[PDB]
Write a protein that binds this ligand. Structure first.
Ligand SMILES: [Hg+2]
Ligand SMILES: [Hg+2]
Ligand SMILES: [Mg+2]
Length: 307
């Protein structure tokens, strides 16, 4: 079976999240969604750095055409951070847009660029809760003239995103729905329609909640299972098909990104935050970062945000 390696050099994260693999520099970026920190890991040189801000963060993606600059979330603001990748604070911050200026207790959560470079991201209540809590989030993309467009409402916990290689489908996760949805994606109008369930956890006895996801070159989705101690591989060719399961030692698996020189090493983030209604004792909940090899598939380089 696949080899799952704990990355000792990286330590433990409260809620490690938002992994992004920059292929040209062979570098993994990620966030902690509770500790207000950004992180960088260069595996070939065993280099780790972090960056501190005073707002909640949920994604970090290099800005297309601008080395040393990243598109990030700061609470409800999408911003450009100028960061040298090693100093413990940004050099400067340029706000782009506040997606929800008048929703004081919301935050941005998972975000990713579509294959054309458009940032998609969604919101949630800061005090969201599972299985039931306040449902206040929406799904957005950042379009022309730095204005966002809304694509879906009634989202409890805005989470993982992916797009099919032919640009005809988008895949999206609200963790509260315990399923992955598929949509028809119109790449020319950047709109989505015909929402329908692709994969429903209760139909397959999958525990926990879908969190982040990514897609491989064959079109399979790799989905992080928070409170499931696993990643799952699911079909996009047929609905409701579980292709494989890979156990990850940490129960609170949060997200996934393919990396390595050949894009065939799956990086997996997790959360050490100990929650009061957990299905796992505290001794099991650590928050390590993992690397999975031997899956027999390749992914895609992380896409930069175009502004
Ligand atoms: Hg930073
Ligand atoms: Hg940054
Ligand atoms: Mg997430």
């Amino acid at each position: 079976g696949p080899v799952v390696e704990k990355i000792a050099e990286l330590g433990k994260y409260t809620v490690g999240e938002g992994p992004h693999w920059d292929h040209e520099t062979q570098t993994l970026y990620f966030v902690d969604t509770v500790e207000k920190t950004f992180h960088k890991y260069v595996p070939s040189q065993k280099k780790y750095t972090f960056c501190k801000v005073d707002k909640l963060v949920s994604f970090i993606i290099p800005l297309a055409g601008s080395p040393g600059r990243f598109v990030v979330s700061l609470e409800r603001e999408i911003a450009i951070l100028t960061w040298d990748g090693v100093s413990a604070a940004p050099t400067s911050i340029e706000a782009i847009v506040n997606v929800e200026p008048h929703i004081k207790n919301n935050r941005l959560n998972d975000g990713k660029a579509d294959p054309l470079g458009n940032l998609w991201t969604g919101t949630m209540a800061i005090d969201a809760g599972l299985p039931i809590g306040p449902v206040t989030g929406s799904l957005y993309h950042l379009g022309a003239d730095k204005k966002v467009k809304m694509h879906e409402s009634n989202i409890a916990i805005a989470n993982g995103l992916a797009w099919s290689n032919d640009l005809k489908k988008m895949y999206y996760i609200d963790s509260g729905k315990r399923r992955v949805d598929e949509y028809d994606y119109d790449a020319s109008t950047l709109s989505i329609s015909n929402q329908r369930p692709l994969f429903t956890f209760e139909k397959h006895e999958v525990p926990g909640y879908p969190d982040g996801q990514t897609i491989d070159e064959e079109g399979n989705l790799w989905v992080a299972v928070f409170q499931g101690q696993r990643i799952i591989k699911i079909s996009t060719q047929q609905p409701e098909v579980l292709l494989d399961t890979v156990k990850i030692p940490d129960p609170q698996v949060t997200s996934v990104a393919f990396g390595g020189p050949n894009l065939d090493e799956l990086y997996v983030t997790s959360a050490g935050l100990q929650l009061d209604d957990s299905s796992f004792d505290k001794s099991l909940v650590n928050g390590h970062v993992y690397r999975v090899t031997g899956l027999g598939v390749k992914g895609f380089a992380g896409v930069k945000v175009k502004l």
